[PDB]
Design an enzyme around this catalytic site. Structure first.
Site, PDB file in Angstrom:
ATOM      1  N   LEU A 106       0.805  -1.220   0.000  1.00  0.00           N
ATOM      2  CA  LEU A 106       0.000   0.000   0.000  1.00  0.00           C
ATOM      3  C   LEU A 106       0.841   1.275   0.000  1.00  0.00           C
ATOM      4  CD1 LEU A 106      -2.542  -1.236   2.655  1.00  0.00           C
ATOM      5  CD2 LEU A 106      -3.109  -0.953   0.249  1.00  0.00           C
ATOM      6  N   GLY A 107       1.988   1.226   0.670  1.00  0.00           N
ATOM      7  CA  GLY A 107       2.872   2.378   0.735  1.00  0.00           C
ATOM      8  C   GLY A 107       4.200   2.129   1.428  1.00  0.00           C
TER       9      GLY A 107
ATOM     10  N   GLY B   1       8.122   4.253   3.046  1.00  0.00           N
ATOM     11  CA  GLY B   1       8.656   5.110   4.078  1.00  0.00           C
ATOM     12  C   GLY B   1       9.995   4.601   4.543  1.00  0.00           C
TER      13      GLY B   1
ATOM     14  N   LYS C  44       1.946  -3.105   9.091  1.00  0.00           N
ATOM     15  CA  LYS C  44       3.069  -2.167   9.079  1.00  0.00           C
ATOM     16  C   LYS C  44       4.375  -2.924   9.368  1.00  0.00           C
ATOM     17  CE  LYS C  44       4.460   2.467  10.727  1.00  0.00           C
ATOM     18  NZ  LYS C  44       5.018   3.212  11.904  1.00  0.00           N
TER      19      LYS C  44
ATOM     20  N   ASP D 176       0.044  15.781  15.852  1.00  0.00           N
ATOM     21  CA  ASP D 176       0.212  16.003  14.415  1.00  0.00           C
ATOM     22  C   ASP D 176      -1.077  15.808  13.611  1.00  0.00           C
ATOM     23  OD1 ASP D 176       1.373  16.726  12.090  1.00  0.00           O
ATOM     24  OD2 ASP D 176       2.605  14.925  11.846  1.00  0.00           O
TER      25      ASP D 176
END
EC number: 2.7.10.2
Lengths: 249, 265
Positions: free
Chosen positions: B16-17, B19, B38, B129
């Protein structure tokens, strides 16, 4: 009832009512709320108001400090300063983390007394909401301006007469207002389902984290028969009961 | 631990992504559940610093918080979470579907975020945040808060950060309300960068001198009004999340009972 304008130093506009202009002052040492009205010279019907604020006074009511009438048509009322201001705005910015049982119960009594009061003097406000309440530096709740579909009782909307049972209904709304921390009442019901659905025997759900004892006071004030809702006397009785028997904590 | 599971429970299906830390995958958990996984890329950060990111979420639980399912503390480390099929709010706002969104949906989305933040509020935490980037979207416009930021009040993006937190590290829940204010702007401008035509360094100073973002195009004036309330220079008199959830949840039953479907809103 007279005050001499010269020694009064106006400070700032804390209020911008589409009905009036409210400001802070200081006469000889005490901070004051000065209701300034132009509106042509239609600052008049407010003088009849400023009148009953003389032959009717409670410590739970915003004390009418005096009146300045100058030549140049500067018509101005002077009221006792309620430091913190609108109860509705306060409830909303401070919320539960500041106002616990004690604080809400206090507010609630500082009204049922200012109401228990006007109930014996044969009076009726017709406009009882928490937008209309104010708060002193030291956490005391006082009413302001003598008189909105949502707050009015059902009977009263059908006619032009507002009894002491009309106000006991508006008190119910204003309690819910408080234990909601200033929500607009009737949270999921369209503006013209309000009166029908209510006349059909509806009452709002108990505000969140509301002590059962309190929610009954509310339901109590919302009796279909105005004669079967309590008085600002029986109410204070129930409030103290709750208070004293620590039914809010 | 007991939040622990065996690697077999898990099947990693679609990535999905990315980093610095590793990756995120959609997978199946016990062959029956879609989850997001994750992943720690070994050597990037430490298993502790990683698995710390999921600590807070063992305690918290709320409909509008992206929930924690399980961890895998071993050599390929995993955090396992609920699957928010539409990805981040910001990306979404900018996309094909972002442009078709009309005000009522936008408002209700805010309501949902506010609903979660309100819970965070009751619990004495701080998100730190807050911005559409850190909000996840599921099917049917469902929006939740996530696995970035929250300590209890027991690296900031300037534009979203309340002056007192940006200046003194006074990160409070009121600081979060301020961010929620800026968040509102993203919602109603299809995701544009707040304070357009302003650089970060300039922004803080402007804000100090009392500057506040104008009402955006086709955003109601009552809405922009609520925003400025969130941007009150004084922490103490910014609204509470309880009121925000309430305000938005009732927006059409109170503030604007006569909404006229605009061109963009």
């Amino acid at each position: 009832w007279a005050l001499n304008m010269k020694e009064l130093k106006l400070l700032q506009t804390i209020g911008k009512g589409e009905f009036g202009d409210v400001m802070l002052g200081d006469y000889r040492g005490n901070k004051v709320a000065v209701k300034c009205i132009k509106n042509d010279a239609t600052a008049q019907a407010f003088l009849a108001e400023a009148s009953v604020m003389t032959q009717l006074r409670h410590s739970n009511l915003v004390q009418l400090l005096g009146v300045i009438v100058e030549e140049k048509g500067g018509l101005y009322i002077v009221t006792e300063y309620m430091a913190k201001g609108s109860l509705v705005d306060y409830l909303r910015s401070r919320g539960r983390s500041v106002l616990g049982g004690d604080c809400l119960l206090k507010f609630s009594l500082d009204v049922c007394e200012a109401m228990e009061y006007l109930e014996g003097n044969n009076f009726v406000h017709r406009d009882l909401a928490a937008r209309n309440v104010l708060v002193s530096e030291d956490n005391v709740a006082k009413v302001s301006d003598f008189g909105p579909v949502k707050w009015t009782a059902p009977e009263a909307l059908r006619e032009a007469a507002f009894s002491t049972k009309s106000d006991v209904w508006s008190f119910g709304i204003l309690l819910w207002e408080i234990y909601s921390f200033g929500r607009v009442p009737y949270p999921r019901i369209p503006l013209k389902d309000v009166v029908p659905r209510v006349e059909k025997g509806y009452k709002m759900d108990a505000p969140d984290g509301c002590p059962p004892a309190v929610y009954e006071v509310m339901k109590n004030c919302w009796h279909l028969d105005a004669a079967m809702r309590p008085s600002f006397l029986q109410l204070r009785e129930q409030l103290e009961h709750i208070k004293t028997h620590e039914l809010h904590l | 631990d007991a939040w622990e599971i065996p690697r077999e429970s898990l099947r990693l299906e679609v990535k999905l992504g990315q980093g610095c830390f590793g990756e995120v995958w959609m997978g199946t958990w016990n062959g029956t559940t879609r989850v997001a996984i994750k992943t720690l890329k070994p050597g990037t950060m430490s298993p502790e610093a990683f698995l710390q990111e999921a600590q807070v979420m063992k305690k918290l639980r709320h409909e509008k918080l992206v929930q924690l399912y399980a961890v895998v503390s071993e050599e390929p480390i995993y955090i396992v979470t609920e699957y928010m099929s539409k990805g981040s709010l910001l990306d979404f706002l900018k996309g094909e579907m972002g442009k078709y969104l009309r005000l009522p949906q936008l408002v209700d989305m805010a309501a949902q975020i506010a609903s979660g933040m309100a819970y965070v509020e009751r619990m004495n935490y701080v998100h730190r945040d807050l911005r559409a980037a850190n909000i996840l979207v599921g099917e049917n416009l469902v929006c939740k808060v996530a696995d970035f930021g929250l300590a209890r009040l027991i690296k900031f993006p300037i534009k979203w950060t309340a002056p007192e937190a940006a200046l003194y590290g006074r990160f409070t829940i009121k600081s979060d309300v301020w961010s929620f204010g800026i968040l509102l702007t993203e919602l109603t401008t299809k995701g544009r960068v707040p304070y357009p035509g302003m650089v970060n360094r300039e922004v803080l100073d402007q804000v100090e001198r009392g500057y506040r973002m104008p009402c955006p195009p086709e955003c109601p004036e009552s809405l922009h009004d609520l925003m400025c309330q969130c941007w009150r220079k004084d922490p103490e008199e910014r609204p509470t999340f309880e009121y925000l959830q309430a305000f938005l949840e009732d927006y059409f039953t109170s503030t604007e009972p006569q909404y006229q479907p605009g061109e963009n809103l």
